[PDB]
Write a protein that binds this ligand. Structure first.
Ligand SMILES: *[C@@H]1O[C@H](CO)[C@@H](O[C@@H]2O[C@H](CO)[C@@H](O[C@@H]3O[C@H](CO[C@H]4O[C@H](CO[C@H]5O[C@H](CO)[C@@H](O)[C@H](O)[C@@H]5O[C@H]5O[C@H](CO)[C@@H](O)[C@H](O)[C@@H]5O)[C@@H](O)[C@H](O[C@H]5O[C@H](CO)[C@@H](O)[C@H](O)[C@@H]5O[C@H]5O[C@H](CO)[C@@H](O)[C@H](O)[C@@H]5O)[C@@H]4O)[C@@H](O)[C@H](O[C@H]4O[C@H](CO)[C@@H](O)[C@H](O)[C@@H]4O[C@H]4O[C@H](CO)[C@@H](O)[C@H](O)[C@@H]4O)[C@@H]3O)[C@H](O)[C@H]2NC(C)=O)[C@H](O)[C@H]1NC(C)=O
Ligand SMILES: *[C@@H]1O[C@H](CO)[C@@H](O[C@@H]2O[C@H](CO)[C@@H](O[C@@H]3O[C@H](CO[C@H]4O[C@H](CO[C@H]5O[C@H](CO)[C@@H](O)[C@H](O)[C@@H]5O[C@H]5O[C@H](CO)[C@@H](O)[C@H](O)[C@@H]5O)[C@@H](O)[C@H](O[C@H]5O[C@H](CO)[C@@H](O)[C@H](O)[C@@H]5O[C@H]5O[C@H](CO)[C@@H](O)[C@H](O)[C@@H]5O)[C@@H]4O)[C@@H](O)[C@H](O[C@H]4O[C@H](CO)[C@@H](O)[C@H](O)[C@@H]4O[C@H]4O[C@H](CO)[C@@H](O)[C@H](O)[C@@H]4O)[C@@H]3O)[C@H](O)[C@H]2NC(C)=O)[C@H](O)[C@H]1NC(C)=O
Ligand SMILES: *[C@@H]1O[C@H](CO[C@@H]2O[C@@H](C)[C@@H](O)[C@@H](O)[C@@H]2O)[C@@H](O[C@@H]2O[C@H](CO)[C@@H](O[C@@H]3O[C@H](CO[C@H]4O[C@H](CO)[C@@H](O)[C@H](O)[C@@H]4O)[C@@H](O)[C@H](O[C@H]4O[C@H](CO)[C@@H](O)[C@H](O)[C@@H]4O)[C@@H]3O)[C@H](O)[C@H]2NC(C)=O)[C@H](O[C@@H]2O[C@@H](C)[C@@H](O)[C@@H](O)[C@@H]2O)[C@H]1NC(C)=O
Ligand SMILES: *[C@@H]1O[C@H](CO[C@@H]2O[C@@H](C)[C@@H](O)[C@@H](O)[C@@H]2O)[C@@H](O[C@@H]2O[C@H](CO)[C@@H](O[C@@H]3O[C@H](CO[C@H]4O[C@H](CO)[C@@H](O)[C@H](O)[C@@H]4O)[C@@H](O)[C@H](O[C@H]4O[C@H](CO)[C@@H](O)[C@H](O)[C@@H]4O)[C@@H]3O)[C@H](O)[C@H]2NC(C)=O)[C@H](O[C@@H]2O[C@@H](C)[C@@H](O)[C@@H](O)[C@@H]2O)[C@H]1NC(C)=O
Ligand SMILES: *[C@@H]1O[C@H](CO[C@@H]2O[C@@H](C)[C@@H](O)[C@@H](O)[C@@H]2O)[C@@H](O[C@@H]2O[C@H](CO)[C@@H](O)[C@H](O)[C@H]2NC(C)=O)[C@H](O)[C@H]1NC(C)=O
Ligand SMILES: *[C@@H]1O[C@H](CO[C@@H]2O[C@@H](C)[C@@H](O)[C@@H](O)[C@@H]2O)[C@@H](O[C@@H]2O[C@H](CO)[C@@H](O)[C@H](O)[C@H]2NC(C)=O)[C@H](O)[C@H]1NC(C)=O
Ligand SMILES: *[C@@H]1O[C@H](CO)[C@@H](O[C@@H]2O[C@H](CO)[C@@H](O)[C@H](O)[C@H]2NC(C)=O)[C@H](O)[C@H]1NC(C)=O
Ligand SMILES: *[C@@H]1O[C@H](CO)[C@@H](O[C@@H]2O[C@H](CO)[C@@H](O)[C@H](O)[C@H]2NC(C)=O)[C@H](O)[C@H]1NC(C)=O
Ligand SMILES: *[C@@H]1O[C@H](CO)[C@@H](O[C@@H]2O[C@H](CO)[C@@H](O)[C@H](O)[C@H]2NC(C)=O)[C@H](O)[C@H]1NC(C)=O
Ligand SMILES: *[C@@H]1O[C@H](CO)[C@@H](O[C@@H]2O[C@H](CO)[C@@H](O)[C@H](O)[C@H]2NC(C)=O)[C@H](O)[C@H]1NC(C)=O
Ligand SMILES: *[C@@H]1O[C@H](CO)[C@@H](O)[C@H](O)[C@H]1NC(C)=O
Ligand SMILES: *[C@@H]1O[C@H](CO)[C@@H](O)[C@H](O)[C@H]1NC(C)=O
Ligand SMILES: *[C@@H]1O[C@H](CO)[C@@H](O)[C@H](O)[C@H]1NC(C)=O
Ligand SMILES: *[C@@H]1O[C@H](CO)[C@@H](O)[C@H](O)[C@H]1NC(C)=O
Ligand code: NA
Ligand code: NA
Lengths: 533, 533
């Protein structure tokens, strides 16, 4: 799978150029793809400063790349039409880093059969095998879930598949387009001898007695206890639910046995930031009162104060009872710090306390908005699987809604819609170059093992409708009349996304559904600064 | 914990000299310690050929080492009296590689308290802390189970401990002397950017549908099935038992539904040996007939034959029913190969079949003899916890027995005894320099995550008894009269080992006991070639 040769190795930081030919949406997606490499690998990217060999990302015919550092200077990489997908950009960069397709492995014929008469004339070069003297498997087995593995339909001539997996169970498994596989990362990190990453900071599921070096100290006689269960709730930890349930642990602040006002803190070990912006995320459970609250502080260690600078950064109040709730906290720490979790028993009828699990800290931006869908499984393949998100306002002030269609018998669809907002009178119309990134979260206990499904679209102010008007024009002017859950009327603009966001079989895999809950993360930002590069 | 600086980094292969001052037993143990580094790290060792900087292992006062590559040329490392323990040698080499003690971590005072007035005058230098500008923690938390962490008694003046863990649960946990911790390896592999190892080849627990790339093909209509359970047995896989049981898998050859003589093969992926000698190990379960057998073949791929050279290397017949059985198969493959597992239904009343789990392949020597103790837990702290192994013959022909004492209220003891054998008339007496290595196996599903408890002793032909005679002289001449399980009388020589082999609390931890089974691996070899180095 990997190329044989030291000459084909790029430096750990790759010089890049995002050519002006590229689509605006492609540019924003290619930069998001680099963020996945910065969190899961030791491979970084930096804009070309005059280096001998660099990657020139441009809009050619389709999506393609050379395998490994060719040492030709300006090395082309095409992200053409319909290639503006994060996984597609990751795939083509894994080629550039020195990997062939997974079905190109020297042993591929022992796992899959290539139906040669079914491949489109002039696209066979994609199905070439490379022997031991040309390729290295790096002692990793054939991976059907590889992001470098083609789908059964890849360049098919008709309805019959080109790649027939010898084991029938993997027929629909091959060709997944979500993220790197655990096996993909293993080969890549072994090839460049990756030790760290730029974005990853910490993951804490409390599966060991040392609890990721988290210190619990209080002069209030109140303490955070490592438990596998709580009688009032939860019956089991978050980490393992659709796995084993009772063999997993979480921290718990019992409020039932403490005085009102009593606090107990849970501090992290000393953390060293490399970027200056962070995203703290965790799962919370409340079996106590609605008066009970969680406070997030940051203890920054400067030279002028070795005892630290404690600053309150979030007050989580009136936490909904009887279910695990995912929370995100935006941080902007530049010096070494400690995350401080403070539970507080309030004035109200309590019977349990506050539980915390799957704490993940990364140097990335938090999602702008979160759409949390409860009792999800009932909607899969349901006639009533036509869901509309609550309304949301973007950074620049545009009002938007998300439409998730699960009524289909095979694929789930997702669509971005502009809606009539309050700021509409002072906004630029048609909406110019706003990239809306919709992510179906794989709720894995470790951020590094998450294969989240993502799709991004950009608002084109020149995209004209099927009748004279602009697609992204003011919804009051081009949209359809709709009704909010309370009864208030509004105008829903055109819907833009995909009909094949994820298959129902993939949706029901990994941890996209966890505790019958689903989280679709949203980030809408202006990307107009990418037209001039 | 790790030293700050690039100048302190040794090359991946360390030049060494095992000085003649060293004890014979120390020499054999230091070479065994290198074998642990070759399997779990990318750090290799080679005898000094004239390199500028090298490690000079000699017998000084106690066990000590400099932290990191000091770049002084001949870098001393002392393995003095009573330091001839694998973990002690690993500890002192982790110092040499660039690590301080775990209780030397800049944040150590947040986890442990140093009782300074209780440390022996002149041994405080072992309890020094090194701040961020001098040390790096490499984003790994404080590890109480670290092999680099001192015991609570370390250089104590009296009965009161010098290291008091702030959390009382870790009081007896600190100071373990078995092997590297998962956290130790993580820091070390990150420091030298380790990708591979010399000895590790493969680990297969069948926890994924792709089954480590293992191909099952047969022209007999017989097949190996990936199951979580078998109605006749086993009720659950081996990998997870004292964890979850039913969420784990294993391969099964159902013999109940096939004709007599029918075979099904399970092949491995193409494997590439680096040393030329291997050790295949797996766990077997039989719910079928005693006539049912397992055949192990090797399919070696040479240039003159691309179809391979299939050779039968083991015939496992009359496998005991209703329990997981650990097996070892010695291999000497030099070219790329495939391990071939062949199940065969025999002539006898069957009701199930053959099950296989936790397959581990490493480029190491297999244990000479295996002492398998069933229903172990009943003996811990029992007056009848005085166990003697069955008799065994060494490579050179000496007869020996192992004594395991579990009757003690806190610690388990192990002792090596020479016994009267058949070859005794033609053997050299007293027995000269035979290293007997006793290993309490941590039955972890992954060989790389095994923290097996090991102790080695060497027969000194000058070691004189408490009354004129030689300790290792002919047992018929110096030993005591004893009785074999069947009633036959023999002479049991002197017992040499330790009274603190493992504590009962450590014995009951990890996977030393699994399915109430224990395996003590034995290797007895002549080490007389180490006197001249
Ligand atoms: C049935 O269901 C329907 C659907 O749910 C219901 O419909 C909804 O009803 C709500 C209630 O009527 C509507 O809420 C109102 O929303 C508007 C708009 O909110 C957004 O825009 C704000 C402005 O952003 C601009 O400015 C910032 C910088 O300041 C820029 O960064 C932005 O880019 C943006 O700039 C663009 O626009 C300006 C022009 O506006 C241009 O000049 C620029 O060039 C740009 O183009 C923004 O501030 C809002 O964000 C805040 O609020 C969020 C929600 O609370 C919160 O998540 C954010 O963090 C942020 O918080 C801050 O403000 C809140 C208070 O709102 C604080 O609590 C918080 O601490 C922060 O400080 C958002 O993005 C909003 O302006 C309205 O607010 C007025 O009224 C509320 C009280 O109702 C007051 O609290 C406000 O102060 C404000 O008061 C105005 O009026 C005063 C006189 O009365 C006057 O004195 C003040 O000066 C001020 O003008 C409402 O909150 C909702 O929009 C609507 N949705 C839809 C789709 O229809 C329906 O009502 C329901 N019916 C029933 C019966 O149930
Ligand atoms: C109550 O309980 C008690 C405890 O359990 C019982 O006591 C036991 O009883 C057994 C039965 O009586 C005893 O078994 C006998 O063991 C001896 C010794 O075995 C060991 O040594 C063998 C020789 O090794 C030397 O040579 C090799 C190279 O060839 C070297 O590498 C060695 O270093 C070593 O060299 C030293 O010694 C020589 C001198 O001997 C010097 O010259 C050198 O300088 C060195 O110092 C060795 O071959 C044995 O290993 C084989 O057997 C193992 C067990 O089967 C097996 O694990 C090994 O893999 C290996 O296998 C090979 O051989 C077996 C057959 O034994 C094959 O199946 C296999 O395929 C392999 O080829 C071991 O290390 C042994 O010699 C005896 O064997 C004779 O008798 C058996 C049948 O009983 C025959 O099968 C043999 O061929 C042999 O026959 C002799 O006699 C013939 C005439 O009758 C003659 O013609 C032949 O030429 C030959 O001389 C026995 O197997 C056991 O030792 C004893 N234990 C104790 C502690 O007391 C008690 O009996 C029981 N009572 C009751 C009633 O229940
Ligand atoms: C103890 O910590 C305090 C908090 O630090 C912050 O939080 C922690 C957790 C980390 O994330 C830190 O990285 C972070 O700084 C310190 O106070 C902070 O001081 C900084 C300046 O050093 C100050 O920054 C300013 O922020 C505004 C943005 O507005 C914020 O604050 C308001 C009011 O609270 C709030 O409503 C907003 O939502 C925002 O959060 C920004 O516009 C400023 O820009 C100016 O300076 C830049 C310099 O490059 C210049 O280019 C611009 O043109 C412009 O003039 C500036 O960045 C933080 O707001 C403030 N934190 C809070 C919560 O108020 C504290 O620092 C000391 O006290 C301060 C009052 C000030 O005197 C500082 O100089 C002192 O160092 C620190 N104390 C010690 C002893 O270390
Ligand atoms: C197809 O495979 C056969 C098996 O190969 C072995 O097994 C596989 C699984 C791998 O582990 C291989 O690395 C391994 O070789 C091949 O047959 C083998 O050929 C080798 C020679 O190439 C031969 O080696 C000799 O072994 C003896 C030790 O005795 C062993 O065998 C006996 C009898 O079976 C058995 O009772 C013992 O327990 C041992 O297992 C050793 O003394 C020999 O030493 C001589 O040669 C060395 C050379 O360095 C010299 O220094 C010495 O002084 C001395 O003369 C030698 O190493 C293997 O025994 C034999 N395997 C078996 C099971 O018999 C096979 O090779 C071809 O056929 C052979 C008959 C012979 O003509 C070879 O030259 C041929 O290559 C191979 N076939 C093909 C086409 O590839
Ligand atoms: C999630 O569903 C429960 C129950 O819904 C029922 O089961 C579905 C599978 C489907 O058949 C529905 O038609 C049924 O009505 C909702 O109600 C909760 O029920 C539990 C019962 O133990 C009760 O304790 C909760 O308090 C109820 N919740 C509320 C808010 O009343 C629940 O509301 C659904 N969740 C959402 C967000 O709609
Ligand atoms: C392992 O123990 C079983 C049962 O022993 C009993 O339980 C112990 C905890 C202790 O209290 C002993 O004194 C008891 O005698 C032995 O017997 C097996 O029992 C099962 C019962 O289901 C039976 O199916 C097996 O066939 C029995 N095994 C044999 C060989 O008869 C068992 O023998 C002990 N194992 C060994 C190696 O001694
Ligand atoms: C897809 O299949 C068709 C049918 O095989 C190919 O079209 C031609 O079909 C005729 C017979 O009807 C053959 O003789 C030709 O060789 C085919 N090829 C061409 C180039 O004309 C078609 O080419 C296939 N591939 C593509 C790219 O469409
Ligand atoms: C991989 O190991 C090498 C050992 O040389 C490290 O490379 C050096 O890193 C320093 C910074 O720490 C640079 O100044 C040097 O230029 C690097 N030298 C070489 C030869 O590349 C590297 O940092 C290790 N990787 C990690 C992440 O630990
Ligand atoms: C162990 O503790 C004893 C007692 O504190 C030390 O012995 C001396 O004790 C006297 C008082 O009885 C002190 O005044 C001395 O300072 C002690 N030290 C010496 C060197 O005499 C003893 O030294 C301690 N440490 C060792 C290494 O035994
Ligand atoms: C760590 O990465 C470096 C990349 O340079 C690899 O080092 C080279 O390895 C080749 C053999 O594969 C040697 O001939 C060179 O001398 C090495 N160069 C340097 C600068 O060290 C190294 O092999 C990688 N480690 C692993 C195990 O993949
Ligand atoms: C309609 O929605 C309910 C939940 O309110 C769900 O249980 C049901 O299955 C859906 N209807 C059908 C016909 O599937
Ligand atoms: C790119 O940005 C500049 C900003 O000044 C703008 O003038 C230009 O029109 C933009 N290019 C296109 C093709 O819209
Ligand atoms: C003696 O051995 C038996 C097993 O045979 C064990 O169950 C028992 O506990 C032991 N005796 C005592 C007093 O512990
Ligand atoms: C070391 O080995 C040599 C082998 O010839 C032997 O002569 C010598 O006596 C041995 N040394 C000792 C100290 O026994
Ligand atoms: Na957990
Ligand atoms: Na298993």
């Amino acid at each position: 799978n990997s190329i044989i040769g030291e000459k084909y190795r790029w430096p750990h930081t790759i010089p890049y150029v995002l050519e002006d030919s590229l689509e605006m949406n492609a540019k924003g997606v290619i930069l998001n793809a680099f963020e996945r490499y910065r969190l899961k690998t030791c491979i970084d990217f930096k804009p070309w400063a005059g280096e001998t060999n660099y990657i020139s990302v441009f809009k050619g015919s389709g999506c393609w790349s050379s395998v490994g550092n060719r040492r030709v200077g300006k090395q082309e990489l095409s992200i053409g039409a319909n290639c503006d997908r994060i996984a597609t950009v990751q795939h083509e960069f894994l080629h550039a880093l020195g990997f062939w397709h997974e079905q190109s492995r020297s042993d591929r014929d022992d796992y899959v059969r290539i139906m040669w008469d079914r491949i489109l004339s002039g696209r066979e070069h994609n199905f070439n095998t490379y022997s031991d003297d040309i390729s290295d498997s790096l002692n990793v087995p054939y991976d059907y879930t590889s992001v470098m593995h083609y789908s059964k339909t890849a360049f098919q001539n008709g309805t019959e598949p080109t790649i027939v997996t010898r084991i029938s169970d993997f027929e629909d498994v091959i060709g997944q387009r979500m993220d790197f596989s655990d096996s993909d990362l293993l080969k890549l990190n072994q090839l460049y001898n990756c030790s760290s990453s730029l974005s990853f900071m910490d993951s804490c599921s409390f599966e060991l007695e040392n609890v990721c070096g988290m210190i619990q100290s209080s002069g209030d006689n109140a303490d955070w206890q490592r438990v596998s269960q709580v009688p009032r709730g939860p019956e089991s930890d978050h980490s393992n639910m659709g796995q084993c349930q009772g063999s997993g642990f979480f921290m718990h602040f019992d409020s039932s046995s403490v005085n009102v006002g009593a606090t107990a803190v849970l501090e992290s070990r000393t953390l060293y930031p490399k970027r200056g912006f962070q995203c703290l995320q965790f799962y919370l459970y409340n079996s106590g009162s609605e008066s009970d609250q969680l406070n997030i502080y940051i203890r920054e260690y400067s030279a002028d104060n070795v005892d630290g600078n404690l600053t309150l950064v979030e007050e989580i109040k009136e936490i909904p009872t009887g279910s695990w709730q995912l929370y995100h906290v935006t941080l902007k720490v530049t010096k070494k710090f400690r995350v401080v979790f403070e539970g507080r028993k309030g004035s109200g009828a309590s019977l349990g306390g506050l539980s915390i699990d799957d704490i993940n800290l990364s140097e990335t931006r938090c999602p702008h908005h979160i759409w949390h869908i409860r009792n999800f499984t009932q909607f899969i393949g349901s006639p009533n699987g036509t869901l509309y998100s609550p309304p949301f306002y973007s950074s620049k002030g545009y009002a938007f809604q998300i439409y998730l269609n699960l009524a289909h018998v095979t694929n789930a669809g997702i669509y971005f819609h502009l809606i009539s907002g309050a700021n509409d009178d002072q906004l630029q119309w048609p909406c110019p170059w706003q990239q809306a990134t919709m992510t179906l979260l794989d709720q894995n206990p470790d951020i590094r093992q998450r294969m989240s499904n993502q799709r991004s679209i950009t608002t084109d102010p020149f995209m004209t409708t099927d009748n004279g008007n602009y697609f992204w024009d003011r919804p009051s002017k081009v949209g359809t009349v709709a009704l909010f859950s309370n009864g208030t009327q509004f105008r829903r603009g055109g819907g833009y996304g995909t009909s094949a966001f994820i298959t129902h079989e993939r949706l029901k895999s990994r941890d996209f559904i966890k505790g019958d809950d689903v989280y679709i993360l949203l980030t809408v930002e202006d990307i107009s600064h990418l037209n001039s590069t």
